[PDB]
Amino acid sequence: SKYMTPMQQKLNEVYEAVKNYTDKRGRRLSAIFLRLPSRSELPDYYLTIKKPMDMEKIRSHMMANKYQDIDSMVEDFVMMFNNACTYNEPESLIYKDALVLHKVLLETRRDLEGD
Template identity: 35%
Template structure:
């Protein structure tokens, strides 16, 4: 599932933490910086044992964006939209569980197949 607004993906602003050089105040204002890359690493490392742990990190990411950015800014609006999407998806998972086995990304599958040596 890719979250889009008007055909524009929401994830780019949340993919990586802000640059310390460009936004030095971010790291003094935000106590617990987190981005989608960190969350993905935690997922791949099996660090989340419950949906609530993942939800906490995603909510923290959204909260950080709203705290640091001005209301009305694009990132602030995108964070609010992302929050709604996260809430809806969480409710779907809680009500119906996963719809089938976990899906592996194409990138991960290609890494796995490239490691296979000669038979």
């Protein structure tokens, strides 16, 4: 069935807002967050980070209707963004991008408060 419930539509719209956000110079900040590297590729991340998370995990939960509200999705984004900000240095760009997208997430939730 092609038609989404109101909640599915809202979930989808929040996700898409973070995925498609582009800054004033045309860069999609989400590109690096789509998929986390392997355990072999980033051993250090997996030793430090308790709950690994990337946007494909959030997308998979979403497409399996595993999020029953918007708060549950925000929780996983915040986890992802906090992980990036824990592992990477405060002066690094992935740290900074995670913060801008955190703002976009929240700004997108506020925009859609009525809907």
